[PDB]
């Protein structure tokens, strides 16, 4: 599993209010968060489906 999958969501310093998803490794589940539109890190997906697709596998 990529290391980035275990990192917490990163909102960043942007002013936008974009709904994105992160893989919550603690829970083994995709979870929504608010992304500001700048300086996204890798645990940041357009959908719950894509978050699981990328990060669910061991």
Nearest CA-CA partner of 20 in 30, 35, 7: 35
Output the domain CATH number for residue 30: 4.10.410.10
| Number of CB atoms found within 10 A of residue 22's CB | 25
* Resolution of the structure in the document, Å: 1.0
Do residues 22 and 45 make contact, with C-beta atoms less than 8 angstroms apart?
yes
Q: What total number of domains does the chain contain? A: 1
Do residues 34 and 14 make contact, with C-beta atoms less than 8 angstroms apart?
no
Rounded to an integer, what is the distance from CA 36 to the centroid of its chain? 13
- The C-alpha atoms of residue 48 and residue 45 are separated, in whole angstroms, by 7
Three-class SS string for the chain? CCHHHHCCCCCCCCCCCEEEEEEECCCCEEEEEEECCCCCCCCCECCHHHHHHHHCCC
Do residues 24 and 49 make contact, with C-beta atoms less than 8 angstroms apart?
no
- The C-alpha atoms of residue 33 and residue 18 are separated, in whole angstroms, by 8
Residues 6+ apart with CB under 8 A from 32: 19, 20, 21, 48
What domain range includes position 36? Answer: 1-58
């Amino acid at each position: 599993r990529p290391a980035f999958c275990l990192e917490p969501p990163y909102a960043g310093p942007g002013k936008a209010r974009i709904i994105r998803y992160f893989y919550n490794a603690a829970a083994g589940a995709a979870q929504a968060f608010v992304y500001g539109g700048v300086r996204a890190k890798r645990n940041n997906f357009a959908s719950a489906a894509d978050a699981l697709a990328a990060c669910a596998a061991a």
